[PDB]
Amino acid sequence: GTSVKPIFSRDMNEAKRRVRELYRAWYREVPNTVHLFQLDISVKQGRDKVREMFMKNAHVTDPRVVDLLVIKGKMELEETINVWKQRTHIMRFFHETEAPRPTDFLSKFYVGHDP
Amino acid sequence: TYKFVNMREPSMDMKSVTDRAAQTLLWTELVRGLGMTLSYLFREPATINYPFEKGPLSPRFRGEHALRRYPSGEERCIACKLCEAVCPAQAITIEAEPRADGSRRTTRYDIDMTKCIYCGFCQEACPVDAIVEGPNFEFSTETHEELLYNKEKLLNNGDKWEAEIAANIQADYLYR
Amino acid sequence: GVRTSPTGEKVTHTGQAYDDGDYRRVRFSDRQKEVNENFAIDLIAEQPVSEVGSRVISCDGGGGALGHPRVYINLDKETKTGTCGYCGLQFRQPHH
Amino acid sequence: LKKTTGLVGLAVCETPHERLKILYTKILDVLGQIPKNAAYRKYTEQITNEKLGMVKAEPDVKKLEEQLQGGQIEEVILQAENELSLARKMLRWKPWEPLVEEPPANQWKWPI
Amino acid sequence: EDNKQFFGRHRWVIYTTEMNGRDTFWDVDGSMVPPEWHRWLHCMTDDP
Amino acid sequence: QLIAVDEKLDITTLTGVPEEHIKTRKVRIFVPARNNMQSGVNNTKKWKMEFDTRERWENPLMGWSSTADPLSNLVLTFSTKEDAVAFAEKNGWSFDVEERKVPKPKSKSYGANFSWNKRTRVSTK
Amino acid sequence: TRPTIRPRNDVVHKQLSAFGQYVAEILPKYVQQVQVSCFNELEIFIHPDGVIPVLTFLRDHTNAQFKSLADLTAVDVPTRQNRFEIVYNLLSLRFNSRIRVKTYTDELTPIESSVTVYKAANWYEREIWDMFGVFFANHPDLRRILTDYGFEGHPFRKDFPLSGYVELRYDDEVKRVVAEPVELAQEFRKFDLNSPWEAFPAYRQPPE
Amino acid sequence: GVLRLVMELSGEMVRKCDPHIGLLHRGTEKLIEYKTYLQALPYFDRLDYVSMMCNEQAYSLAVEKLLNIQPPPRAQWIRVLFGEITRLLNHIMAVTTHALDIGAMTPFFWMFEEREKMFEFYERVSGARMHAAYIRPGGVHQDLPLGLLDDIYEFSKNFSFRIDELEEMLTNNRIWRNRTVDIGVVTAEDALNYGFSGVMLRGSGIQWDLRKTQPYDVYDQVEFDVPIGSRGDCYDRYLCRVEEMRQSLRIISQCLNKMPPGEIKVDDAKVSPPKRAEMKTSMESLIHHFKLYTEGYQVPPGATYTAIEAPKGEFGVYLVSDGSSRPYRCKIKAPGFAHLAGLDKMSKGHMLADVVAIIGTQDIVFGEVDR
Amino acid sequence: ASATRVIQLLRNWASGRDLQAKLQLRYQEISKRTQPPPKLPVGPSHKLSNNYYCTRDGRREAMPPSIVMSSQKTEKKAVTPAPPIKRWELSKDQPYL
Numbered sequence A: 001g002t003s004v005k006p007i008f009s010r011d012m013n014e015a016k017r018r019v020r021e022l023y024r025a026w027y028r029e030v031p032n033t034v035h036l037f038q039l040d041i042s043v044k045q046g047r048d049k050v051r052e053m054f055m056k057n058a059h060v061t062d063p064r065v066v067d068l069l070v071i072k073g074k075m076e077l078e079e080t081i082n083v084w085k086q087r088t089h090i091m092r093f094f095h096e097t098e099a100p101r102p103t104d105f106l107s108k109f110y111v112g113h114d115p
Numbered sequence B: 001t002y003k004f005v006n007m008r009e010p011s012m013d014m015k016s017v018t019d020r021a022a023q024t025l026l027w028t029e030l031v032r033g034l035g036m037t038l039s040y041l042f043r044e045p046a047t048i049n050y051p052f053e054k055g056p057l058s059p060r061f062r063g064e065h066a067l068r069r070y071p072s073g074e075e076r077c078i079a080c081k082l083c084e085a086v087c088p089a090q091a092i093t094i095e096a097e098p099r100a101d102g103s104r105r106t107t108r109y110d111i112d113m114t115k116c117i118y119c120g121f122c123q124e125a126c127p128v129d130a131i132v133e134g135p136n137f138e139f140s141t142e143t144h145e146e147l148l149y150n151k152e153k154l155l156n157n158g159d160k161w162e163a164e165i166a167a168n169i170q171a172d173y174l175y176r
Numbered sequence C: 001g002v003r004t005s006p007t008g009e010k011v012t013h014t015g016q017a018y019d020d021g022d023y024r025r026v027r028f029s030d031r032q033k034e035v036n037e038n039f040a041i042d043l044i045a046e047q048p049v050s051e052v053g054s055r056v057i058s059c060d061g062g063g064g065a066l067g068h069p070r071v072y073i074n075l076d077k078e079t080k081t082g083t084c085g086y087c088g089l090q091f092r093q094p095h096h
Numbered sequence D: 001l002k003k004t005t006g007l008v009g010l011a012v013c014e015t016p017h018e019r020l021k022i023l024y025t026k027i028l029d030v031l032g033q034i035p036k037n038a039a040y041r042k043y044t045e046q047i048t049n050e051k052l053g054m055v056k057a058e059p060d061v062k063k064l065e066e067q068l069q070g071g072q073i074e075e076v077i078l079q080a081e082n083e084l085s086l087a088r089k090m091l092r093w094k095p096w097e098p099l100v101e102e103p104p105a106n107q108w109k110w111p112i
Numbered sequence E: 001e002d003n004k005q006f007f008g009r010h011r012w013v014i015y016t017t018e019m020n021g022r023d024t025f026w027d028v029d030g031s032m033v034p035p036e037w038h039r040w041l042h043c044m045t046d047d048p
Numbered sequence F: 001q002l003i004a005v006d007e008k009l010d011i012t013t014l015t016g017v018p019e020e021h022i023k024t025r026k027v028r029i030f031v032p033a034r035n036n037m038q039s040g041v042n043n044t045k046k047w048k049m050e051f052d053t054r055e056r057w058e059n060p061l062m063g064w065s066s067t068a069d070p071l072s073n074l075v076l077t078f079s080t081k082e083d084a085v086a087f088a089e090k091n092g093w094s095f096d097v098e099e100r101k102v103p104k105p106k107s108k109s110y111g112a113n114f115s116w117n118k119r120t121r122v123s124t125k
Numbered sequence G: 001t002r003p004t005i006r007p008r009n010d011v012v013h014k015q016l017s018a019f020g021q022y023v024a025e026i027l028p029k030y031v032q033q034v035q036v037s038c039f040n041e042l043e044i045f046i047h048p049d050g051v052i053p054v055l056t057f058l059r060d061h062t063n064a065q066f067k068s069l070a071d072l073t074a075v076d077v078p079t080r081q082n083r084f085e086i087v088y089n090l091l092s093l094r095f096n097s098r099i100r101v102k103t104y105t106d107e108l109t110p111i112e113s114s115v116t117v118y119k120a121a122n123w124y125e126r127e128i129w130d131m132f133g134v135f136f137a138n139h140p141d142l143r144r145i146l147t148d149y150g151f152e153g154h155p156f157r158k159d160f161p162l163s164g165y166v167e168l169r170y171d172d173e174v175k176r177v178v179a180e181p182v183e184l185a186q187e188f189r190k191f192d193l194n195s196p197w198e199a200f201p202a203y204r205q206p207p208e
Numbered sequence H: 001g002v003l004r005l006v007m008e009l010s011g012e013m014v015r016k017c018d019p020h021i022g023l024l025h026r027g028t029e030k031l032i033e034y035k036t037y038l039q040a041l042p043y044f045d046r047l048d049y050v051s052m053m054c055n056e057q058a059y060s061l062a063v064e065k066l067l068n069i070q071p072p073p074r075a076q077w078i079r080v081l082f083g084e085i086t087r088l089l090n091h092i093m094a095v096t097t098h099a100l101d102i103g104a105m106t107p108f109f110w111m112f113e114e115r116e117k118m119f120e121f122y123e124r125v126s127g128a129r130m131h132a133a134y135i136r137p138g139g140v141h142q143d144l145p146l147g148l149l150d151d152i153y154e155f156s157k158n159f160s161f162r163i164d165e166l167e168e169m170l171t172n173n174r175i176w177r178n179r180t181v182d183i184g185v186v187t188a189e190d191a192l193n194y195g196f197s198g199v200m201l202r203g204s205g206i207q208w209d210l211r212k213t214q215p216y217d218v219y220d221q222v223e224f225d226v227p228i229g230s231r232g233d234c235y236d237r238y239l240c241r242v243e244e245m246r247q248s249l250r251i252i253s254q255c256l257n258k259m260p261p262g263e264i265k266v267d268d269a270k271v272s273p274p275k276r277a278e279m280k281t282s283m284e285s286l287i288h289h290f291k292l293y294t295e296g297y298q299v300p301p302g303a304t305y306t307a308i309e310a311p312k313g314e315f316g317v318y319l320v321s322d323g324s325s326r327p328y329r330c331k332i333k334a335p336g337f338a339h340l341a342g343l344d345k346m347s348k349g350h351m352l353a354d355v356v357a358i359i360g361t362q363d364i365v366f367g368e369v370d371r
Numbered sequence I: 001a002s003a004t005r006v007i008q009l010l011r012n013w014a015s016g017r018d019l020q021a022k023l024q025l026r027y028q029e030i031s032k033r034t035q036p037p038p039k040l041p042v043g044p045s046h047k048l049s050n051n052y053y054c055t056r057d058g059r060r061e062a063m064p065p066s067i068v069m070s071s072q073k074t075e076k077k078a079v080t081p082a083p084p085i086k087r088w089e090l091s092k093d094q095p096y097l
């Protein structure tokens, strides 16, 4: 039961197809984005960041969530291609100015009360 | 009712056509605008000689904040926290405790003037005329830190501006 | 009634003064510290006690609508004096 | 005939009675295919028949404007094509059928 | 004062050349006016 | 035209919440208790959702109270406990639910004040 | 009712009730409820599938001809199964009246775009998507219109924090504006203003 | 204000024009939900900051409709008088800034002197030059000072000559005409469908004015004419705005002559705060002052959409009440939003220099567009 | 205005109007900055009797909206939301500009 209305895909396979299309488009766009924005990162680590962002949502098991994430990624790609962003928006993906938050129990115990 | 702004029909008789042609060829309206500007040059300018001359103001004007006190010399504030509750910008911070003589008085009264919107809600919420918005407006500052007023600064402002503040309140209090 | 800290700072009417080991004193070096010279408690202590021949007196702080809300004070207790909750003025029945 | 109706983009239509009659005939023909019990069909038929009888009994154009309560016969004609297009779209939609489904239990409960 | 001037220019102040601790022959500003003359000078009242 | 998929709802990846503010927080689902200073009961009708309290420290300047958690002032209202539980589950927050406290009915009797032999007899009124 | 009380108009109430009944009769497939408020406002509750038919009927019908889209917005109610309600405000110049149409949806169910019916709905639907995350199908170009580029989340949702999650500043080491987790020198003070002793008996709910 | 404008140009002609907004998005609607109604009032001053008291009036009317109360007659007359003054201010700003962008730049100063005088009126009535917060959801905060009406009459009897000088500089100038005539033409049907309002509607020949069809405060007790255009271009809209300035002068004269006596806020101390002397002498007045300035007044549950004829068009608010003293939702409708949305259509097949004229004739302020 | 006669004539001719009648600089014609105290009238509700608040309580007269055609629970002439708007009149004060 639990009948719901499709957004774009009827099942998971079409969702995977759209995900692969978006990943292909991003993988093409990475070098041109790196050159045009005069970024200090390399193409390798930019594509690694794209891979990491795609892996961040690897646990989704619902076509509606999957293709809505695809829609948001397509919006981000459109923003990046049309040079609507500045270097700051692109560089925000890397968090180069944020201190590295430790994970072990001792470090969190020493720094403060935050688990 | 309604009017028409651009619903005229130009006359097509020979005299009107010749008049429009003369307007086109001799630039009559341009000369008329030139004459308007020339005439407007020969009239007295509206500039005042600041800072030696000041712009007109009103007893209702809202300027820099100040804390007042009674003629006996004790501060009017009783830490009711109505001004802090009504503040649209959350710019007032208040802490209180009983005094050495048991009076209900504040130990902390801060106003962040970089958050304040100068709406005057605090002085109209005050039940004892303690917090007011004085007539001073020439208090620009070279650093962000000096625009964070504490209780001592506000009491100093009250002692500094009490004469004008009292005169303005005497002028305007019958409208409140 | 401004006092001075043993280190050298002025003590405010709220009693605030940085202790010796406090680093936050560095904000006042090459500058000053804002302290109001008139203490309300001392100023209100100098006011004379009013003598009225009634058991209940009313106080509005003086000035009519320019004072505080009008309150009534009971003066039956001869041990102490009646003190206004807003203005701090003191009233007393004519003992002896 | 008048000129410059006063609305930008709305041109003057000479011989408007024929246009109104043709549009009303088309509207009635499209309404004929709708089920009889549909409220839309009977209501729009009543309105269209009223307007057609009104226009068939008045040769003057200004008196027709005053009687039809719309004024500026050109915009009445515009409303006529709007109604015709809506009739075709609604015949395609078929809204006389019962409600698709009820909302959840407290979908419209306010406050909270 | 000069009531024949238009509103705004009918009152003015000539600043002192030496206030509390600095030489104000050239460096004058509007914060040097005391509150009572501040009230009179900004036309908040008609009485000096 | 209908997927008819069967899986629990999860919108976590779409809300934009940071990673460490989802699985680390602990929301509380409760009916707020009546303020004992007053006898009114109008504030004990709905269900509230609030997050766990985090660190608050004193600002070195002005001595103000600073914070670092953006959810320190977030409070939500729900008609029933089920709605709050469903919202918390679909948003991915671990929750504790407290059952509503209802004042039990009481037997009041004005005549019990003036008792012939019972202890309920009052000394004054 | 002495001068401090607002005057009530009976004629407009009856007219709006009659027109609501008329609209309900003509479109039973979608209309779920019709209401007229005590200050003479008519709002109509419809099923999500009927957004295009109802709007087209109200715009094009001779008796309605609501040619102007006054406003389109959304309201977030977390306690409902369908989280968001979509509100359309329409103005009729021919008959000098205003109508309201309400719809509902959740995070994952799209709503049909009404740009074909009203050209004004374009930026309104863009803003609804930006602020609430409600997707609109067959929209010409749906994208953020108000938030910053790369902004994550939808701020007008009730569970979004007031100050957000990230703040901006300039860093001299990287010579650019950077985004960092938000820290406030003074936390926003939360006030509990709601009082007991309910104010309006007419709105009292059953004790269930 | 500040605008980012991405466009495609084929030679001189503009093919596509895509405006990017949000550079002044402050999140006002979410901030309003954390305030009481009185606390949320000053946001409307900042929404459209050329016509402040008009936004105050719209919000006050919405709250009054939800509260089932009405302001006293003198309050309504004061509201309409200051709304017409604010309309004069807004039209001066719009016309002079449009001319400045074209390149005239002299009438800007000429009319900003008058704008300064009207700011003096604002400051005298509320103590603030622009964000007064004078119009409240129960009436007005304070009564006018004893000499204000005379000064308003003195100001308003010389403004027609200033408008005449403006027209002498701009109306019949051939450069101004060639800059504004047949630019940004919009049809009546497109204007209606695209959501336009105000002058943007009336320039195409549509006869619509919210002060006439749906009057709100006392606008049905004064008579004035509504300028109507014929070609739907920038020149017709400029003429309409000038004629609206003249009609505003007419309404100001009528308001000055017919000001009635009485109180200024509704005599209901559960909505409007009591006078200071009452608060300082009466127990009930003190209790009501305390509760009104700490918690605020509760508004019965319900939703309303209230619109007024603002100087820039139809300004509306969709206000939702949950029964508490804080609004549950407050949607703000700004005409500049729809006008900037239609900018793309209005600049089809025009020069690059005509986009500035179209933006000027749309009368766009980004505070209300972004909110 | 302390302007000479020749300058007044020149500016009047160049502008085309008589400026001295309507000057844009304020002079003694404005009101004085000090005013007498204002008495200020009380509201209608200031009665001592026959003034119970339950008879003048606007908020408590608000009611939930009336429900018509709740779906969960003849000639029949066609109707419109409101009578058609009357056409405006052509401003018999200045019909054309």
Ligand SMILES: CCCCCCCC/C=C\CCCCCCCC(=O)O[C@H](COC(=O)CCCCCCC/C=C/CCCCCCCC)COP(=O)(O)OCCN
Pocket (backbone or CB within 6 Å): B024, B025, B026, B027, B030, B031, B034, H174
């Ligand atoms: C039997 C003997 C006959 C001998 C022949 C003599 C006959 C002469 C009769 C006519 C001569 C007049 C010609 C003078 C120049 C005319 C140029 C002209 O008219 O062009 C205008 C344009 O001219 C201008 O508008 C230029 C103005 C630019 C603004 C600059 C302001 C100038 C005004 C200030 C006065 C200048 C003073 C000049 C004298 C300088 C002294 C050294 C046309 O433009 P439109 O109105 O758009 O119409 C065409 C499209 N359908």
Ligand code: SF4
Pocket (backbone or CB within 6 Å): B083, B086, B087, B088, B089, B090, B091, B092, B111, B115, B116, B117, B118, B119, B120, B121, B122, B123, B133
């Ligand atoms: S003037 Fe307004 S914003 Fe400023 S402190 Fe007073 S209440 Fe707060």
Ligand code: SF4
Pocket (backbone or CB within 6 Å): B076, B077, B078, B079, B080, B081, B082, B083, B084, B094, B122, B125, B126, B127, B128, B129, B130, B131
């Ligand atoms: S300043 Fe006035 S309102 Fe604020 S706490 Fe003190 S007495 Fe209360």
Ligand SMILES: [Zn+2]
Pocket (backbone or CB within 6 Å): C059, C060, C061, C068, C084, C085, C086, C087, C088, C089
């Ligand atoms: Zn006292």
